[PDB]
Structures are given as C-alpha cells and as structure tokens.
C-alpha cells in the first residue's frame, strides 16, 4: 500500500469528485485533502492512499500538466 501525492487541487476541481470512481477502478483505501490554512477552504493538494499495482500506473498517464482533473501535478508521496 503506497502513498500518491497530488497537487494544484482547488475548491472543487476533481480530486474529490474522482475518489468516488477511484474507488472503482483503484480501490483507493484511504482518501483526504488539505485547507487553506486560513478559510479552511480545500486548496493546495491532497493524499490517496492505494496499493502498489495502481500507483504505478496512476502516476504514469496522470501526472504531466495541469488540466480539468485529467493529468494534475501528481506523483508519489
């Protein structure tokens, strides 16, 4: 059970709207998110916690740019 650690999340971009999905293709275990340290808003990145057989993959065609919850800056933790 690896960790991945993706970034530039915003109040509602994808992240948490994937992890409802994740959960069926990736089985994630266990899923949280960061605040801004202020409004206690989500904004900065967040955590996934999987297996070591989707991690590999889930970084390799995700991580790459910054788009609409398609690729995102992510990579492991």
Same mark, same amino acid.
């Given at each position: %059970?690896?960790? +991945?650690? /993706?970034?530039?999340?915003?109040?509602? &971009?994808?992240?948490?709207? /994937?992890?409802?999905?994740?959960?069926?293709?990736?089985?994630?275990?266990? /899923?949280?998110? +960061?605040?801004?340290?202020?409004?206690?808003?989500?904004?900065?990145?967040?955590?996934? =916690? %999987?297996?070591?057989?989707? /991690?590999?993959? &889930? +970084? &390799?065609?995700?991580?790459?740019?910054?788009? %609409?919850?398609?690729? +995102?800056?992510?990579? =492991?933790?």
């Amino acid at each position: %059970m690896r960790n +991945i650690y /993706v970034g530039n999340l915003v109040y509602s &971009a994808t992240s948490e709207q /994937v992890k409802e999905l994740f959960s069926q293709f990736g089985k994630v275990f266990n /899923v949280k998110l +960061i605040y801004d340290r202020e409004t206690k808003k989500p904004k900065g990145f967040g955590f996934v =916690e %999987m297996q070591e057989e989707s /991690v590999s993959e &889930a +970084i &390799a065609k995700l991580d790459n740019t910054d788009f %609409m919850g398609r690729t +995102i800056r992510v990579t =492991e933790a």
